[PDB]
Structure 1
Amino acid sequence: GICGIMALASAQMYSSFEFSCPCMPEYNYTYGIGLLIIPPIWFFLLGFVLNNNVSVLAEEWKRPTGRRTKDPSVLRYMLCSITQRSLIAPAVWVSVTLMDGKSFLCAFSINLDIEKFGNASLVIGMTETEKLKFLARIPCKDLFEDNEVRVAATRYIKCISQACGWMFLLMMTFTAFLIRAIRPCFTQASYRQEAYWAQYRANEDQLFQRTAEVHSRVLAANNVRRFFGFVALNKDDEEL
């Protein structure tokens, strides 16, 4: 479906994105956490734009009451099904980013205790501004000279990022399991009036196709006789 291709595209944009973490302390956090948050808000609003039933939902909330074709508990159902469909490409991005651990490493490596992984005399002798500037280059593979305290710290934050990646997949799946145990009682067999209005819209456009094409057959025959001096019809006269 559309959410099968958006789940595949969210994992595929992560693979072709080249993570380019700055190594500065005031721009580490907003780049690292911003890349966790802002591509879900993009993949969520993409899940509204590519779901054409929000255009139907738009014009139903526009009219005043009396003309409205659904109950407000049926317009609220269209809201909830278009939402919990479009929350798969966000949550594939947030889970793939957290298992890979590049974004926790960029965002949180100015918060480390560098005593725990290696040489404490790396940092004894620098000011707190230079302390942060030493720590902030840990994600940046080709700007950090120590390879033992780099490997020990990118392993610790890739671990804690994978712990938060599994507790996220466990609270997302336990949420979606709670709505396969509750939300059928929220719909209460109103999806049939949704599916009747779905079929009513689809055939009304198709009946508009055959009627306008037949109305086109009428105008085209008069225009062709005026064209060269000849009116001509093959088995396109069978609708005429």
Structure 2
Amino acid sequence: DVMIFNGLVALGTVGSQELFSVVAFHCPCSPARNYLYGLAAIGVPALVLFIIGIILNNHTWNLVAECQHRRTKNCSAAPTFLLLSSILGRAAVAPVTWSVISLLRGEAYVCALSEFVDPSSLTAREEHFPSAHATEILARFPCKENPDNLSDFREEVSRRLRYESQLFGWLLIGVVAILVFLTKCLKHYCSPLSYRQEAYWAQYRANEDQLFQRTAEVHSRVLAANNVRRFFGFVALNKDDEELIANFPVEGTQPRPQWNAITGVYLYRENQGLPLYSRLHKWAQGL
């Protein structure tokens, strides 16, 4: 549901950027210059949204942290690759939907490859094409700048390039669908565990992260209240905060090697047959 909500939010963001008044497109009708603009208008929003989907997903930062302090190449062909699959999923949701939307609009590709259409190879007009002014008048086709002598030629070349754009767009969404199917079949075939145990593991990681955020906020609040009380002599707590101080007294916090034993990417090591679903769980069973 949360992954479906993130996919719906990414689709709504691409649809909002898809119909932008000036962001959507402004084709330069110029030879050897417009396909660079098409490459820009498809790729740089794709690369920006791909980078942003890397940025907003925290499991990338878990991965560079595990590469940083451990650095022992323990992240083999493992659930670290499943983490990377989730990274590329929640990241590359947005560049491929930007690419298929701005390919089904067709505008970037007809602006792009208009400089490379052969003048004598197309139809629906007479061959009034001086070779010295060939590619220059070819490039002015997406701006509706062709004269009445080549208006039908311009409509024919525009329809042909819009065909090739939409065919390339449908083929690209087909190959990204088959890549999603292939990575999911490869995940469920190279998994060491079930799908029911994988769902239980997903519910465990969700419950552990939610409980850990709640109790880290509460333990931090109790530590802050102890420091504040040591400073002034009292703490201005709420009623619920006074209940938090009454319920969970602390004295000290776990050292940095303990926090290092907690952190890392997820694992599925098994302590004597019994499974360990997270590094916190591995550390708790280790004591």
**TM-score bracket, shorter-length normalisation:** 0.7 to 0.9
1:93 corresponds in structure 2 to 98
Match of residue 7, structure 1, among 4, 8, 11: 11
1:21-60 matched pairs, under 5 angstroms: 21-60=27-66
Task: Give the Å deviation of 1:3.
Answer: 3.2
Q: Aligned partners of 2:8 and 2:14: how far apart in 1?
A: 10
Q: Aligned partners of 1:169 and 1:183: how far apart in 2?
A: 21
Q: Aligned partners of 2:168 and 2:57: how far apart in 1?
A: 31
Q: Aligned partners of 1:119 and 1:107: how far apart in 2?
A: 22
Q: Aligned partners of 2:109 and 2:76: how far apart in 1?
A: 45
1:184 corresponds in structure 2 to 188
Helix, strand or coil at the partner of 2:32: helix
- State the structure with bigger RCO (CA 8 A, min sep 6), 1 or 2: 1
Q: Aligned partners of 2:237 and 2:102: how far apart in 1?
A: 62
Task: Give the Å deviation of 1:50.
Answer: 1.0
Question: Is 1:73 aligned to residue 78 of structure 2?
Answer: yes
1:11 touches 1:92 (CA, 8 Å); kept in 2?
Answer: no
Q: Aligned partners of 1:234 and 1:177: how far apart in 2?
A: 52
Match of residue 126, structure 2, among 112, 120, 125: 120
- Count of aligned residue pairs for this structure pair: 231
Task: Give the Å deviation of 1:202.
Answer: 4.3
1:99 touches 1:161 (CA, 8 Å); kept in 2?
Answer: yes
Helix, strand or coil at the partner of 1:113: coil
Give the aligned residue type for 2:107: K
Normalising by structure 1, what TM-score? 0.80
1:221 touches 1:232 (CA, 8 Å); kept in 2?
Answer: no
Task: Give ranges in structure 1 of 5+ residues lacking alignment.
Answer: none
Match of residue 133, structure 1, among 133, 136, 142: 136
Task: Give the Å deviation of 1:168.
Answer: 1.9
Q: Aligned partners of 2:117 and 2:236: how far apart in 1?
A: 83
Q: Aligned partners of 1:182 and 1:72: how far apart in 2?
A: 12
Task: Give the Å deviation of 1:83.
Answer: 1.0
Task: Give the Å deviation of 1:204.
Answer: 3.5
Question: Is 1:106 aligned to residue 111 of structure 2?
Answer: yes
TM-aligned CA distance change 1:110 to 1:179, over 3 Å: same
CA RMSD of aligned residues (A): 3.0
Q: Please give the per-residue CA displacement for 1:8-38, whole angstroms capped at 9, x wherever unaligned.
A: 2123212112311111112112112332323
1:23 touches 1:136 (CA, 8 Å); kept in 2?
Answer: yes
TM-aligned CA distance change 1:72 to 1:197, over 3 Å: farther
TM-aligned CA distance change 1:52 to 1:28, over 3 Å: same
Normalising by structure 2, what TM-score? 0.69
2:223 corresponds in structure 1 to 215
Task: Give the Å deviation of 1:197.
Answer: 5.6
1:74 touches 1:194 (CA, 8 Å); kept in 2?
Answer: no
Q: Please give the per-residue CA displacement for 1:27-68, whole angstroms capped at 9, x wherever unaligned.
A: 1121123323232222211111011121122211111357x7
Match of residue 172, structure 2, among 157, 168, 172: 168
Question: Is 1:151 aligned to residue 155 of structure 2?
Answer: yes
Task: Give the Å deviation of 1:108.
Answer: 0.8
Q: Alignment identity in percent?
A: 24
